[PDB]
Amino acid sequence: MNIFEMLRIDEGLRLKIYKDTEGYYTIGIGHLLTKSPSLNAAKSELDKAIGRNTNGVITKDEAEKLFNQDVDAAVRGILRNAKLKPVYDSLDAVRRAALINMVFQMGETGVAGFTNSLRMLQQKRWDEAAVNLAKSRWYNQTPNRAKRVITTFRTGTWDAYKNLAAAA
């Protein structure tokens, strides 16, 4: 398992514009298009991202290309962030993937806001961090995904993902 497989399980793959859990227009592997309520706006952003007149439908390769850019960007956001980087540097490989997942989902800023959890992770206080992480809108809104990521931080293994969809 790796970050791509992991996020592919959590986000799924849809080739037509769809609404995410918050009701925002998205496509592919969790690629957020816009927070605007206009489908047109969404289609415009999609054409711009793809470089062609899509009419709201993309191919698998196109979805995978946005996905690679998105993972790349999450990693880069982490390394550029003064609060995130030190946590990321302190972690083992599996737990690094859990951090990327959250940044992919919520963005740098959002994650950078979990001050107490970040400290705990940095200190390697796994159980404590897992409890703190659970006291969040994130956990209450998308609990099954939140549970997978938290278990990953707790254990440092891929066990939460070793049975599911996307692949595992």
From Swiss-Prot:
E.C. numbers: 3.2.1.17
GO MF annotation: an example: lysozyme activity
Cross-referenced PANTHER family: T4-TYPE LYSOZYME 1-RELATED
Outcome reported for the amino acid change (mutating residue 30 to F): Almost complete loss of enzymatic activity. The enzyme is destabilized by 1.5 kcal/mol
Annotated protein name in UniProt: Endolysin
Disulfide bonds: none
Active site: 11 (proton donor/acceptor), 20 (proton donor/acceptor)
